């Protein structure tokens, strides 16, 4: 099961206040209109790749999703990151944890930190040792699909861990649905309103109209012709040609000489 992302996954890239401005930036974002994998919790918990960063979202009524695990081999030999929402708080630990093949919550260590109707979205990325988490919580009325509309995520926490992550697995409690996408290194034009809230965005590599919009620094384009790019034919093969010389150079006769 797959579904279209519908221009979701935008977040504030930095902690700088800007307002009434169109700002261009290159960062890891969920590409517009790519599709994400749709997982169902009712009648799973696979280990998924992390790749270059993860877009995660879920829809709930009962809040069965409790958390997640990030790491590499997840074999108690190296550090793994465990994040769990429990009771009245959120506990984050990084340890040589022993995991179940299918960890769940029934209804040495290096680091420790303690902090449908409901849509929750998160972005997870690893930069310079930091596990950066962005998030948003909004109300919904949709069961059958991923909600449409634009909303930017705000930074939630930035964890100084220094952990290598290649794979992750979610944690669900046992007696609803979630989506996973991946981020890519591309440029966006972000629109900030008068209060500094990002209200819109252009994916500069989505199609030729978006390229025109980014080129012109505008969300509105006038009639006419704009030059936005450069076409180049790429080489497909290579040619190496030398004369029929089989003779090896007599370096040994100079180098390994008995007399200098």
């Amino acid at each position: 099961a797959y579904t279209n992302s519908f221009t979701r996954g935008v977040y504030y890239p930095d902690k700088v206040f800007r307002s009434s401005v169109l700002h261009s930036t290159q960062d890891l974002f969920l590409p517009f209109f790519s599709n994400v994998t749709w997982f169902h919790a009712i009648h799973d918990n696979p280990v998924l790749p992390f790749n270059d960063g993860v877009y995660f979202a879920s829809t709930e009524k009962s809040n069965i999703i409790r958390g997640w695990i990030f790491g590499t081999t997840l074999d108690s030999k190296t550090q793994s990151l465990l994040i769990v929402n429990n009771a009245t708080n959120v506990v984050i630990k990084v340890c040589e944890f022993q995991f179940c093949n299918d960890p769940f919550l029934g209804v040495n260590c290096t680091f420790e930190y303690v902090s449908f109707k409901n849509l929750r979205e998160f972005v997870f990325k690893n930069i310079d040792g930091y596990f950066k988490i962005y998030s948003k919580h909004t109300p919904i009325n949709l069961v059958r699909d991923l909600p449409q509309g634009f909303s930017a995520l705000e930074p939630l926490v930035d964890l100084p861990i220094g952990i290598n992550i290649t794979r992750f697995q979610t944690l669900l409690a046992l007696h609803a649905a979630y989506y996973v996408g991946y981020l890519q290194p591309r440029t966006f034009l972000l629109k900030y309103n008068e209060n500094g809230t990002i209200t819109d965005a252009v994916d500069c590599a989505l199609d030729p109209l978006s390229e025109t919009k980014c080129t012109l620094k505008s969300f509105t384009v006038e009639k006419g012709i704009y030059q936005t790019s450069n076409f180049r034919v790429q080489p497909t093969e290579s040619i190496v040609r030398f004369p029929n010389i089989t003779n090896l150079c007599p370096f040994g006769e100079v180098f390994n000489a008995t007399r200098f």
């Binding site: 700088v16 206040f17 705000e154």
Partner: peptide, 20 residues
């Protein structure tokens, strides 16, 4: 008389210089 989001530390203008 402007509002920063709770996590923002400073702001900048159109010239990308420090505004606030």
């Amino acid at each position: 008389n402007k509002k920063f989001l709770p996590f923002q530390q400073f702001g900048r203008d159109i010239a990308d210089t420090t505004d606030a």
